Structure 1
Amino acid sequence: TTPLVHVASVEKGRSYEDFQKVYNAIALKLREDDEYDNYIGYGPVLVRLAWYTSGTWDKHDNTGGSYGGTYRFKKEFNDPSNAGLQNGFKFLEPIHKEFPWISSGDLFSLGGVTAVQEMQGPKIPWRCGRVDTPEDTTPDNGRLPDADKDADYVRTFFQRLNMNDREVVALMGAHALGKTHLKNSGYEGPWGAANNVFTNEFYLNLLNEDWKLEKNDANNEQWDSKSGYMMLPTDYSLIQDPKYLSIVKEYANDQDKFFKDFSKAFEKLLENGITFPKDAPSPFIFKTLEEQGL
C-alpha cells in the first residue's frame, strides 16, 4: 500500500561491545572454514549476500532492502540469479544461534562488513537496528540485475537503488572478490588473482588485461583474458561507457580513493530504506581480529 517507514530500533540492551562480539564470531569462522570453494573461503559469498539482500530495495516504495531481513528466493536458490547464496546463509546460521538476539537484517549486512574488513578491505561504518519483519517478505524475483546487459542498463538499474555513476563503479570493485561459478549463474571464472583479498584489482584488470568476448560452457558470452580472468558483460560495460571509464581509471590509480568511496557506497547500500533516529547510536567501526590480537 502506501510507502512504509522503517525506523532503526537498537536490539534491546545491546551496545557496540555486543556487536563486536558478533563480528568476531563471523571473523573467526571465516578463518576456520578455510577450504570452502577451493580455498577461497566464505568472504566473497558473504559480501555477495549482503549486496544481494540490500539490492532488493526499491526507492520508489521503500520495499525490500536490508531492514526486514525476510526474503523469498526464486526457486529456492535453484535459479541463475540467486544460486550460491544459500552458502552464505548456511555459514551465518551457526552465528545466529550463538547470538539469537541479533536481527536477521543486522546479521546479513554485518556479514558483508565483516568479510570486507577481514579480507583487508576498508573499514565500513555499520549501524544496528534492523528489525525482522516476518509476514512482510520481499521476493527477489526480478529485483537484482542481469549480467548480460550494457552500460545503459547498469546505469538505469542502479538508479532504483539511488546510486550514481561513481557509486556504481565503486561498488562493482567488490568483484575483485570470489568468482562466478558455471553451475550457479551460468558464468565461470574469477575476476582476478587475489580472490580473497580486497584491493582495486578489478579496475586494473579491466584496463590492463587483453580481453576476448566468447561463449562459456553455458553458451553465455563473457570476456576472458589470457591470465585466466573473466568479466561479465556488465563489468566490461564500465570501460565501454566513457563516463564509467574515467572513474574506472581513477580507482585503478588510487587505492585509497577507491577504499574511501567503496566504504561510503557500501554502507549506503546496506542502509537504504532505513531511518535512523537523531538520537540513535553513532555508526560502529569494528576492529579486525588482527587489530585485537585475536
Structure 2
Amino acid sequence: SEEPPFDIRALRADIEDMISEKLELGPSLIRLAWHEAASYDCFKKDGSPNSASMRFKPECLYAGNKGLDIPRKALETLKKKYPQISYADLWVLAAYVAIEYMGGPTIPFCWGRVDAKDGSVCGPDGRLPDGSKTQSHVREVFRRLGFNDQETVALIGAHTCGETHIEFSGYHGPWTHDKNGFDNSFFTQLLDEDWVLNPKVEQMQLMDRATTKLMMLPSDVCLLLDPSYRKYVELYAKDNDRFNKDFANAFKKLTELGTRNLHKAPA
C-alpha cells in the first residue's frame, strides 16, 4: 500500500456524497470509466485508454460517448478540490466508488495514471460497441480490448445498474427493476424473462413480456444466442459471489489497460 498525494479517504467520501444527491450519476460514472478504456486496441497498441482522452475532440463527440459530458462535468468539482488527482485516476476511482456504493465489489485501486494532454492521442471512431450489433461484433470489440469470453460477459453485467436514454443512445429504459443495485440481476433478468420486441422504440430493443418495463439491447440478448457467451450468463446468474469476483477482476484489468507505473492505494 502506498498513500497517494491527494486525500483519497476524503475524496472517496465526496464521491459517495455526490452519488447520493444524484442517483442516476453512479451508473454514468461506470459508463464513463468504461468508455475511456474501450478506445484501446491491443493489436495496434493505441487508442489511449485510461488517460481521460475523452475530454478532447474528436473522442468526446463519438456517438458512443453521447451523454458522458454529464459525469465528466460532475467530476470537475472534485478535480478542483483535489488537484493532485489526475482526471484519469479520478474517473477510475469514481467508478470504483460507484460500484461499491451500489452494493458491488470493492475493487483494489491503483493510482498514477497520466492524463492525455491533447486530442492527438485519440484513437479513431468505431471502437465503442454498438447496441444494435450482435455476438460476432461484441467478440470482435472485446478481443480487440484483450478480453476472453468470460471477462466479456462479466463486464457486460454492469448493465445491472442504470438505464438507456433516448437522447443519448436512442434506446429507452433500464435492464433491471433496481437500477441502483449492483449485482447479478442483469444475468437473472436475461434468462428468466421472455424478451419480446418493443414495438414503439425506433431503435430495436426488447422488453420483458411480464411487465414491459425492462429492456434489453440486441447486444445483451446476443449473449444468449452465442453458446460460449450463454455459458457465462448462466454462471453469473446462478452465483452472485462469482460475478462479484470476476467483475472486480475484469473491471480492474479494464481500467488498467495501457497504463504503467501505478501504485497500490490503501483499502
User: Does the TM-score normalized on the shorter chain lie above 0.5?
Assistant: yes
Residue 82 of structure 1 corresponds to 65
Q: Letter of the aligned partner of 1:274 in structure 2?
A: T
1:54 to 2:37 alignment: yes
Cα pair 1:73 1:139 within 8 Å, conserved: no
1:284 to 2:248 alignment: no
1:104 to 2:104 alignment: no
Tell me the secondary structure at the aligned position of residue 44 of structure 1: helix
Residues 148 and 130 of structure 1: is their aligned pair in 2 closer, same or farther, counting only changes over 3 Å?
Answer: same
Q: 2:260 aligns with which of 275, 284, 291?
A: 275
Residue 237 of structure 1 corresponds to 222
Matches within 5 A, 1:1-294: 15=4, 18-31=7-20, 33-34=21-22, 40-71=23-54, 72-74=56-58, 77=61, 80-135=63-118, 136-139=120-123, 141-217=125-201, 219-226=202-209, 227=211, 228-276=213-261, 281=263, 283-284=264-265, 286=267
- Deviation (angstroms), 1:275: 2.5
Residues 23 and 65 of structure 1: is their aligned pair in 2 closer, same or farther, counting only changes over 3 Å?
Answer: farther
Residues 114 and 66 of structure 1: is their aligned pair in 2 closer, same or farther, counting only changes over 3 Å?
Answer: farther
- Deviation (angstroms), 1:73: 4.6
Q: Deviations over 1:119-170 (max 9, x none)?
A: 1101111110101231343156222111111111111110111010000000
Q: Letter of the aligned partner of 1:186 in structure 2?
A: G
Could you tell me the percent identity over the aligned residues?
A: 37
Cα pair 1:55 1:65 within 8 Å, conserved: no
Gaps of 5+ in 1: 1-12, 35-39, 287-294
Taking the aligned partners of 2:63 and 2:235, their CA distance within structure 1 comes to 32
Taking the aligned partners of 2:63 and 2:218, their CA distance within structure 1 comes to 15
Taking the aligned partners of 1:67 and 1:184, their CA distance within structure 2 comes to 22
- Provide the aligned length of Structure 1 versus Structure 2: 262
TM-score for the superposition, normalised by structure 1: 0.83
Q: Deviations over 1:55-113 (max 9, x none)?
A: 11111233234442223355955x64222111111110111010011111101111111
- Deviation (angstroms), 1:30: 1.1
Gaps of 5+ in 2: none
TM-score for the superposition, normalised by structure 2: 0.91
Structure number having the greater helix percentage? 2
